[PDB]
Amino acid sequence: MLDPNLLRTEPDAVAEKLARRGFKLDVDKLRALEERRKVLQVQTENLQAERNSRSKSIGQAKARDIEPLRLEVNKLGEQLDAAKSELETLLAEIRDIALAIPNIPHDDVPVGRDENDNVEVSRWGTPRQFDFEVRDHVTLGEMHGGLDFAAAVKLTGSRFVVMKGQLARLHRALAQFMLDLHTEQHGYSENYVPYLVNQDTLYGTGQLPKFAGDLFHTRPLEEEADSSNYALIPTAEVPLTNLVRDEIIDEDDLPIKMTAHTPCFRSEAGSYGRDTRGLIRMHQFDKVEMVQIVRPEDSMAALEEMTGHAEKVLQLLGLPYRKVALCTGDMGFSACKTYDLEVWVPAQNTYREISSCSNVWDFQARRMQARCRSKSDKKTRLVHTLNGSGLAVGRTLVALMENYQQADGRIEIPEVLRPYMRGLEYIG
Amino acid sequence: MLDPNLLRTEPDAVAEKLARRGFKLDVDKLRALEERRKVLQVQTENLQAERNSRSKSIGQAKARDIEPLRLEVNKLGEQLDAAKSELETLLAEIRDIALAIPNIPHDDVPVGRDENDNVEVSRWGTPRQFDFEVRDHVTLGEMHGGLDFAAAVKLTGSRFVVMKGQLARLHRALAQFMLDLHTEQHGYSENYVPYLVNQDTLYGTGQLPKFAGDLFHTRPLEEEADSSNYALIPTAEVPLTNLVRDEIIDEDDLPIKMTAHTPCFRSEAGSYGRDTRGLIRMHQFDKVEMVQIVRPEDSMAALEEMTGHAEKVLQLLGLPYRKVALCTGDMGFSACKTYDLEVWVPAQNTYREISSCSNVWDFQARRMQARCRSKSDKKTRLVHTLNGSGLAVGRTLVALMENYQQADGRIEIPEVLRPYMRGLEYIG
Ligand SMILES: N[C@@H](CO)C(=O)NS(=O)(=O)OC[C@H]1O[C@@H](n2ccc(=O)[nH]c2=O)[C@H](O)[C@@H]1O
Numbered sequence: 092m093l094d095p096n097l098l099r100t101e102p103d104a105v106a107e108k109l110a111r112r113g114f115k116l117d118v119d120k121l122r123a124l125e126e127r128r129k130v131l132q133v134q135t136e137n138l139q140a141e142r143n144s145r146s147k148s149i150g151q152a153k154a155r156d157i158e159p160l161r162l163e164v165n166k167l168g169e170q171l172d173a174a175k176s177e178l179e180t181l182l183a184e185i186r187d188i189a190l191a192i193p194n195i196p197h198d199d200v201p202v203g204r205d206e207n208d209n210v211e212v213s214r215w216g217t218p219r220q221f222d223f224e225v226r227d228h229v230t231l232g233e234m235h236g237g238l239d240f241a242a243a244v245k246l247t248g249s250r251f252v253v254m255k256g257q258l259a260r261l262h263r264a265l266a267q268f269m270l271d272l273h274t275e276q277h278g279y280s281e282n283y284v285p286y287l288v289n290q291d292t293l294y295g296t297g298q299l300p301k302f303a304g305d306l307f308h309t310r311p312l313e314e315e316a317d318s319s320n321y322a323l324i325p326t327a328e329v330p331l332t333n334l335v336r337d338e339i340i341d342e343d344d345l346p347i348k349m350t351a352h353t354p355c356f357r358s359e360a361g362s363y364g365r366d367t368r369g370l371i372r373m374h375q376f377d378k379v380e381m382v383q384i385v386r387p388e389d390s391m392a393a394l395e396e397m398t399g400h401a402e403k404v405l406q407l408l409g410l411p412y413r414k415v416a417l418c419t420g421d422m423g424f425s426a427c428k429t430y431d432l433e434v435w436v437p438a439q440n441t442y443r444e445i446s447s448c449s450n451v452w453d454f455q456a457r458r459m460q461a462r463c464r465s466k467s468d469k470k471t472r473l474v475h476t477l478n479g480s481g482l483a484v485g486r487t488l489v490a491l492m493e494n495y496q497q498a499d500g501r502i503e504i505p506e507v508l509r510p511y512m513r514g515l516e517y518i519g
Numbered sequence: 520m521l522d523p524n525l526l527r528t529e530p531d532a533v534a535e536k537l538a539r540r541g542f543k544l545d546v547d548k549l550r551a552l553e554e555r556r557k558v559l560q561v562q563t564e565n566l567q568a569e570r571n572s573r574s575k576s577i578g579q580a581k582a583r584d585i586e587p588l589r590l591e592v593n594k595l596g597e598q599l600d601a602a603k604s605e606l607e608t609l610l611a612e613i614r615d616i617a618l619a620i621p622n623i624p625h626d627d628v629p630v631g632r633d634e635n636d637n638v639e640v641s642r643w644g645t646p647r648q649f650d651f652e653v654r655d656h657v658t659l660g661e662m663h664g665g666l667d668f669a670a671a672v673k674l675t676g677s678r679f680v681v682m683k684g685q686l687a688r689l690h691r692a693l694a695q696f697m698l699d700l701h702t703e704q705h706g707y708s709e710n711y712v713p714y715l716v717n718q719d720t721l722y723g724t725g726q727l728p729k730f731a732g733d734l735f736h737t738r739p740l741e742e743e744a745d746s747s748n749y750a751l752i753p754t755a756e757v758p759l760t761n762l763v764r765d766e767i768i769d770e771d772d773l774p775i776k777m778t779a780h781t782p783c784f785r786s787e788a789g790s791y792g793r794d795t796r797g798l799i800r801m802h803q804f805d806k807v808e809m810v811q812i813v814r815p816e817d818s819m820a821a822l823e824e825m826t827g828h829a830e831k832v833l834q835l836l837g838l839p840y841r842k843v844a845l846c847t848g849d850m851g852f853s854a855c856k857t858y859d860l861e862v863w864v865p866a867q868n869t870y871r872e873i874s875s876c877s878n879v880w881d882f883q884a885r886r887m888q889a890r891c892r893s894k895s896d897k898k899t900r901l902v903h904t905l906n907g908s909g910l911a912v913g914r915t916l917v918a919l920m921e922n923y924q925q926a927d928g929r930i931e932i933p934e935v936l937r938p939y940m941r942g943l944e945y946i947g
Pocket residue numbers: 325326327328357371372373374376378380444445446447448478479480481483484485486
């Protein structure tokens with residue numbers, strides 16, 4: 092959610108910044124709705140005052156006929172309820188516009204139309220030269236009998252996988268290593284979170300109202316018919332960021348650094364034809380998430396810190412990658428600034444996204460009413476939120492299998508993972 | 520699913536065994552439906568033969584007027600379709616009865632009406648005598664700030680939890696230890712499975728048709744409108760057992776021993792008032808599952824082996840427990856024989872179920888069409904399936920926290936878990 096006072100004092104300036112994302116702000120409709128709102132608001136508050144006054148006239152006349160007065164109060168009560176209902180409809184209409192507005196891109200963000208306009212910031216490692224024909228992770232998984240897409244189609248449907256044996260163990264070892272790295276070395280606190288969340292949570296991090304169709308929704312439970320309209324989490328960012336919803340945090344307690352390993356459930360729109368085979372785009376994928384809750388003046392430094400934390404995973408695993416600054420046209424809804432880490436994928440002869448690290452500024456904090464305060468301060472302010480993959484576990488497995496494959500199809504276990512695999516050097 | 524030939528040759532004998540579970544088999548309705556079925560089946564097959572014959576008469580007369588013949592064939596085609604539809608309705612009616620029938624209890628199972636009739640088989644360990652007032656895991660979790668039910672109500676709703684910090688780490692350490700024990704010592708193969716499954720899978724393990732209301736169901740996806748009616752898994756038993764659906768396994772490849780660590784999603788009926796506070800009964804809980812696919816003559820020995828595997832977790836963790844043989848009236852739908860392991864819960868002054876180990880016999884194998892064959896054999900036979908918790912992770916955490924609590928509220932880390940906690944002796 093953008094600052095509503097900033098959508099009042101500077102609507103054309105806000106529209107200019109948003110146009111860089113390729114978003115057209117309906118400034119004229121917002122202005123016409125706001126003008127009709129001020130009219131209904133005065134009319135409504137005048138009715139609230141006179142109803143309040145007429146009811147007080149009854150209560151005091153009861154001590155000293157209360158029938159002509161009780162009739163008037165009920166007529167006014169009906170008029171106020173109608174005016175309040177008419178007002179609420181207009182407020183819901185303003186909300187539909189306001190809550191579909193993406194975040195204002197920060198001045199640090201390069202201007203661009205799409206991903207082909209993204210700026211490379213750095214590159215680490217050298218992609219391996221092979222002495223044989225590179226096999227993809229799908230072929231390698233079939234050779235080991237460890238990645239089974241057919242068994243998952245039978246169990247569920249498309250865009251699911253069954254991992255069996257040592258390759259399943261390796262996937263677990265990756266998540267164990269990532270969580271240990273962030274909690275032991277990077278100052279993050281571990282969390283076990285719910286994988287089903289409510290509407291409030293989804294509005295809080297921006298999945299609602301605009302991206303309902305990208306989620307798996309659950310039907311309400313018989314015993315909880317009016318309080319169980321849930322959706323599966325598309326990322327641990329959703330439950331983790333919402334832990335500070337409706338909180339006033341003492342500034343001394345900031346930064347709040349949280350991590351979680353969860354499955355992620357998505358039904359991303361128009362992906363039909365893009366990455367048809369393999370683990371890159373799945374309905375269910377594991378991800379180790381890093382979330383930061385910080386003071387407004389520390390969010391830019393926190394973005395560099397958190398990106399470095401994701402980079403460390405790739406570096407320790409010896410996976411070559413490139414760090415990319417996303418342009419205005421390729422950023423996610425909530426982000427004001429994003430870096431994507433793209434890992435070398437040998438069978439694809441390119442770098443593929445494995446992490447997205449964002450500074451959300453106060454956009455989610457505004458929706459969640461998440462604020463901070465120094466103990467002295469007469470006023471509170473909205474916190475800044477940040478999130479980043481450290482990393483997407485299935486995509487790490489893709490990268491690991493392909494970069495560490497041997498001529499016979501054996502998978503060399505990266506050195507840092509060997510303590511997580513009982514010192515095993517190779518799978519196969 | 521029970522053997523349909525056994526529901527024909529011995530319906531009163533099957534009814535007698537089922538009455539011990541407190542299930543009344545409608546033998547009279549099953550007989551009346553079966554008699555009407557034989558009538559419609561003869562009528563239908565006679566129509567299939569004559570339609571087939573009349574169509575062949577056209578094709579051969581076309582070489583040597585095909586209009587009076589094509590008219591007759593279309594009239595017969597309409598009659599056959601009607602008869603086939605009438606027959607299918609009766610088959611669906613027989614299925615509704617047949618698929619709601621629980622498994623026949625094995626003769627080893629003691630006769631009883633409910634859980635108060637269950638027989639204790641063994642007891643291991645001595646419940647700890649405390650020098651202070653025992654705190655429950657909910658109080659201990661609040662003291663450590665590690666178990667937060669309020670944050671989960673805010674994120675989702677009731678019967679969810681947020682675990683924070685060292686207690687979240689401990690929960691992860693429990694699952695890591697259980698998986699390592701079963702894959703390293705007990706001969707199980709690790710699996711990463713889907714947490715969303717289809718109708719076929721749910722019918723395969725017996726959740727459908729009778730227990731639909733105990734599941735979280737997802738609404739179909741826009742891009743997969745006719746093939747995405749899924750439900751969240753209530754146990755890894757559902758995807759794991761279904762991996763052998765429509766398979767003929769070479770008997771030399773048996774036993775197939777699989778393990779998986781997954782969240783489990785349930786909305787169990789009439790639980791309102793039972794275990795209102797804490798981790799014992801949750802909508803989302805982690806569980807390390809053991810599944811065995813075996814030859815029909817080895818399932819009874821496999822049940823003892825698998826129960827011993829679950830017992831080993833409790834023994835290594837130094838958690839006192841009791842092993843209980845469930846009576847006919849307390850067994851789950853699919854089971855023919857079950858042992859429950861009940862762990863000592865100090866704040867409750869009793870043993871609480873932490874594992875349920877069952878021999879399913881051929882009940883799921885029949886629904887899944889999962890069979891085995893010796894390479895010589897002219898005939899295949901249905902495999903036997905077994906499943907057992909090793910263990911329910913949240914309930915292990917309840918037991919661990921309560922049995923290992925110190926006077927100040929610190930949690931002593933069990934010796935076997937310390938390598939999983941970087942040698943940490945105590946939390947706090
Ligand atoms: N909370 C933030 C940061 O993690 C977030 O979710 N951003 S993201 O870019 O949508 O997703 C975070 C990461 O998840 C992976 N991913 C995505 C889709 C898919 O089908 N499979 C994947 O493995 C991608 O590598 C991506 O960089």
